Amino acid sequence: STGSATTTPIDSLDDAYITPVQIGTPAQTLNLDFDTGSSDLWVFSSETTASEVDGQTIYTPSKSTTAKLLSGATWSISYGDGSSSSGDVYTDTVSVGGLTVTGQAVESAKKVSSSFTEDSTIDGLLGLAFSTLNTVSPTQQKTFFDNAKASLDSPVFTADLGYHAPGTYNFGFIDTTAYTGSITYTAVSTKQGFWEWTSTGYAVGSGTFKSTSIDGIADTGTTLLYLPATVVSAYWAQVSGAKSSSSVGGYVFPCSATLPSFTFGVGSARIVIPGDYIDFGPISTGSSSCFGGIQSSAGIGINIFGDVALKAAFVVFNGATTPTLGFASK
Numbered sequence: 001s002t003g004s005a006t007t008t009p010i011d012s013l014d015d016a017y018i019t020p021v022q023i024g025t026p027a028q029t030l031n032l033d034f035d036t037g038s039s040d041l042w043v044f045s046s047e048t049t050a051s052e053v054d055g056q057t058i059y060t061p062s063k064s065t066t067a068k069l070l071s072g073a074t075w076s077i078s079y080g081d082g083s084s085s086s087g088d089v090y091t092d093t094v095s096v097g098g099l100t101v102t103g104q105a106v107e108s109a110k111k112v113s114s115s116f117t118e119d120s121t122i123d124g125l126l127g128l129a130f131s132t133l134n135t136v137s138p139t140q141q142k143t144f145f146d147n148a149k150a151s152l153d154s155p156v157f158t159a160d161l162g163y164h165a166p167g168t169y170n171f172g173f174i175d176t177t178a179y180t181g182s183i184t185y186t187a188v189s190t191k192q193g194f195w196e197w198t199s200t201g202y203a204v205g206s207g208t209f210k211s212t213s214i215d216g217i218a219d220t221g222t223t224l225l226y227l228p229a230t231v232v233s234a235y236w237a238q239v240s241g242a243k244s245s246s247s248v249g250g251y252v253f254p255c256s257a258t259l260p261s262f263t264f265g266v267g268s269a270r271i272v273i274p275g276d277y278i279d280f281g282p283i284s285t286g287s288s289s290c291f292g293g294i295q296s297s298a299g300i301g302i303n304i305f306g307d308v309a310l311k312a313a314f315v316v317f318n319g320a321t322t323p324t325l326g327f328a329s330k
Contacts, residue, residue: 001099001100001172002098002152002153002170002171002172002173003095003096003098003148003170003172004168004169004170004171005019005020005021005096005097005168005169006097006166006167007019007034007161007162007167007168007169008166009162009164009165009166010122011121012164012281013280013281014161014162014164014223014307014311015223016119016121016122016221016223016307017034017161017167017307018031018032018121018123019032019033019034019096019097019169020032021095021096021126022093022094022095023092023093023094023106024061024065024067024092025064025065025066025092025093026064027095028059028060028063028064029057030043030057030059030123031057031121031123032123033122033125033126033221034126034128034169034220035125035126035127035128035219035220035221036128036195036218036219036221037080037129037194037195037217037219037220037221037222037304038077038079038125038127038129038133039127039128039129039130039131039132039133039134039143039193040075040077040107040125040127040134040135040136041094041104041105041107041125041126041127041143041144042075042077042085042106042107042109042124042125043058043106043107043108043109043123043124044056044057044058044059044109044116044123044124045058045059045061045108045109046058046059046060046061046062046108047087047088047110048087048110048111049110052111052117053117054118054120055120055121056122056123059106059123059124061090061092061108064092066093067090067091067092069088069089069090070088070089070090070091070136070139070141073088073105073136073137073138073139074086074087074088074089074137075087075089075136075137076135079221080222080300081115082115083113083115084112084113085109085112085113085116086111087107087108087109088107088110089106089107089108089136089141090105090108091103092104092106096144096169097170099148099152099171099172101144101148104144105134105136105142107136107141125221126144127143127144128143128144128145128157128220128317129195130146130190130193131143131146132190132193133193133194145157145317145319148171148172149319152171153172153173154172154174155318155319155320156173156174156316156318156319156320157172157319158174158175158178158314158315158316158317159310159315159317160178160314160330161220161307161310162311163274163276163277163311163312167311174316178314179314179328179329179330180328180329180330181329182269182328183314183316183327184266184267184268184269184326184327184328185267185316185325186266186267186324186325186326186327187324188324190323192217194217194219194302195217195218195219195325196215196216196217197215197216197217197218197325198213198214198215198216199215199216199265199266199305200212200213200266200267200268201213201214201264201265202214202227202231202262202263203263203270204234204235204238204260204262204263205238205261205262205275207238209263209265209270210234211265214228214264215302216297216302216304216305217302217303217304217305218305218310218315218317218325219304219305219306219310220307220310221306222304222307223280223293224280224294224295224307224308225262225273225278225293225294225295225304225305225306225308226295226296226297226300226303226304226306227295227296227297227303228296228297229296229297229298232251232296235260235262235294236251236292236294238260239253239259240254240257241253241254242254242292248283248291250291250292250295250296251294251295251296252289252290252291252292254289255282255287255289255290256288258275259275259276259279260275261274261275262275262278262294264305264309266327271309271312271329272312273309273312274312277312278292278293278294278308279292279293280292280293293308312330313327313328313329313330314327314328315327
């Protein structure tokens with residue numbers, strides 16, 4: 001089997017991407033944030049504290065003839081951005097782009113933090129990291145990908161995120177029309193539960209490539225590119241007037257600037273992030289200070305190849321017995 005679904009930016013900045021997901025019988029379609037940095041499929045629901053729901057579409061398990069309470073199971077998750085959610089668990093039928101999994105754990109939120117409430121466009125998350133990170137207790141549950149894997153034509157999914165435009169998540173096949181050149185594959189460590197890999201270096205604009213190992217995670221659920229302070233300083237030094245602002249919470253730059261590209265290495269291959277992808281717009285409405293899309297990972301504890309990086313590539317998440325990651329230009 002295979003599946004193919006379009007993923008759409010939630011706003012004009014590509015702050016996140018939502019993908020429609022069918023849950024239950026008859027189908028209830030919710031728009032979920034596919035997150036290769038976590039491993040829980042959780043949704044706003046009829047059980048979510050009413051004051052914490054503001055415009056989201058909810059899953060109502062009592063209206064699904066295939067929903068079953070997973071007795072005694074609870075979940076609770078905290079994300080790198082300080083947001084969180086928790087609740088109980090149902091199993092139900094879940095389909096993405098024509099690919100169906102029966103008996104998928106659907107984690108129903110009883111509570112969500114303010115950042116989730118405040119984002120009316122995201123109805124929940126669909127985790128695509130390794131199932132070892134799944135938070136369900138006392139019986140850990142599998143991700144949608146892990147459940148689908150054996151049925152897929154090939155044990156892979158791909159992320160093809162758009163810049164200010166829709167893109168595609170495919171399951172079970174590699175669309176050879178969706179990228180240019182060849183796909184370069186690179187090793188993955190699953191030791192921390194992430195799609196963790198080592199970039200071979202970087203360049204700023206038309207500058208020379210610096211060969212240096214940068215360990216980090218391919219994370220579709222993180223907006224920006226978080227890299228070591230040395231790398232980030234070298235990038236922003238090429239933008240007149242750019243500075244790190246403790247009050248704003250990262251590097252800002254004059255909105256009048258033209259940003260240089262940023263290149264990262266994948267083995268001997270190179271992925272070029274155009275400068276415009278690094279612009280996250282005014283820090284507040286009407287400001288002439290703009291927020292940068294490349295930020296320091298210092299104090300995160302891990303480097304994160306988030307959407308800023310991934311949307312410059314066609315990315316293969318290869319879930320074969322020994323997982324790997326592939327990157328192509330597009």
